[PDB]
C-alpha cells in the first residue's frame, strides 16, 4: 500500500542526534493519541509534527 498512514504513525519516537529540545508531536500507538515530545532538531523520522492538529489529521485512520 502507498500513502500508508501506518508507515508514519506507527514509528517510535526518534529525538535524533542534534542537541536541542524542540516541542513536537508524535502519534503514540499504545495510547492511540497525538502526544508531545522534545525533538533534537535534525534527522529523526516522519512521526514528528509541528502541531497536535497536524498529527491528528495525519494519523486520523491507521490500517
Amino acid at each position: 500500500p502507498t500513502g500508508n498512514n501506518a508507515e508514519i504513525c506507527l514509528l517510535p519516537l526518534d529525538y535524533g542526534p542534534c542537541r536541542a529540545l524542540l516541542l513536537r508531536y508524535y502519534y503514540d500507538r499504545y495510547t492511540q493519541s497525538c502526544r508531545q515530545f522534545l525533538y533534537g532538531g535534525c534527522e529523526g523520522n516522519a512521526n514528528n509534527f509541528y502541531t497536535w492538529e497536524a498529527c491528528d489529521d495525519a494519523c486520523w485512520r491507521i490500517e
Binding site: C18, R19, A20, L21, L22, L23, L38, G40, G41, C42
Partner: protein, 223 residues
C-alpha cells in the same frame, strides 16, 4: 551536560538560554547586542535570557530580551549539519556587569588536546532524561580530526570538530545545543550533535567557530 558539575551562579556569564515558552537551546553572548547559537535552534519567536542560573525560577535580576533578528548561516544544510551556526540580534542591548558578560571570538583555531569548558542546561543522563535547575559545566579536550572522522565516518566536515572522551561518561546532551565550547577564554565551538550522549566512541560534535569569524563580523556590521 552528562558527567559534569554544577558551575555555580554566574560563573559562566556569557551563557544564555533561548526561550520560546520553554528552554529549547543555549547560546553565547559575543557583545551587548548579539548571541551566537546553532542553526538547528532557529525559531521565529525567541526570548533571550541572560544572567541565568536556575532557569526554572525568576529570581528578579536576569535580563530577558526579545530577539529582533535570527540569521542562520546561508550555507546551512539541515541534512549534513554543515555550517550549523546562527546569530541572534537583541531588540535592545544587554547591560553588561559581572553576571552578564560577552565572550571573545577566536583569533586562531584550537589544537587537539586543548581543554575546553562546555556548559548548558541539557539532559544530565545517558539513559532516560533529567533536566537540571542550575547550569552545568564540563571540562573536555578537543579530539584529533582523525579520531573524529573514525567515530563518525562520512559525517565530519571541515567546519566540525569533536571534543570529550572516547571512553564515555562525559558529554554535552539534548538541551545544550547552541551553547558554548570555550578554550583559553575564546569561543571555539557551538554544541551541535552526537550519536546519543556520553556513549563509548561517540564523542560530541561541535561547530568550529574559528571558521566563521569573517561571517560573524560582517553580519553584525551589516545588521
Amino acid at each position: 551536560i552528562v558527567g559534569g558539575y554544577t558551575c555555580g551562579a554566574n560563573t559562566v556569564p556569557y551563557q544564555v538560554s533561548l526561550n520560546s515558552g520553554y528552554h529549547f537551546c543555549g547560546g553565547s553572548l559575543i557583545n551587548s547586542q548579539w548571541v551566537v547559537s546553532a542553526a538547528h535552534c532557529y525559531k521565529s519567536g525567541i526570548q533571550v535570557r541572560l544572567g541565568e542560573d536556575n532557569i526554572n525560577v525568576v529570581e528578579g535580576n536576569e535580563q530577558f530580551i526579545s530577539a529582533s533578528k535570527s540569521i542562520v548561516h546561508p550555507s546551512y544544510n539541515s541534512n549534513t549539519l554543515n555550517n550549523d551556526i546562527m546569530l541572534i540580534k537583541l531588540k535592545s542591548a544587554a547591560s553588561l556587569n559581572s553576571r552578564v558578560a560577552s565572550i571573545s571570538l577566536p583569533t586562531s583555531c584550537a589544537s587537539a588536546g586543548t581543554q575546553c569548558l562546555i556548559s548548558g542546561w541539557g539532559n544530565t543522563k545517558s539513559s532516560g532524561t533529567s533536566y537540571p535547575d542550575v547550569l552545568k559545566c564540563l571540562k573536555a579536550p578537543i579530539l584529533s580530526t582523525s579520531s573524529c572522522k573514525s567515530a563518525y565516518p562520512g559525517q565530519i566536515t571541515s567546519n566540525m570538530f569533536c571534543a570529550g572522551y572516547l571512553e564515555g561518561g562525559k558529554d554535552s546532551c539534548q538541551g545544550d545545543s547552541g551553547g558554548p565550547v570555550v578554550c583559553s577564554g575564546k569561543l571555539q565551538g557551538i554544541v551541535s550533535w552526537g550519536s546519543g550522549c556520553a556513549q563509548k566512541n561517540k564523542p560530541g560534535v561541535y561547530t568550529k567557530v574559528c571558521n566563521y569569524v569573517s561571517w560573524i563580523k560582517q553580519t553584525i556590521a551589516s545588521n
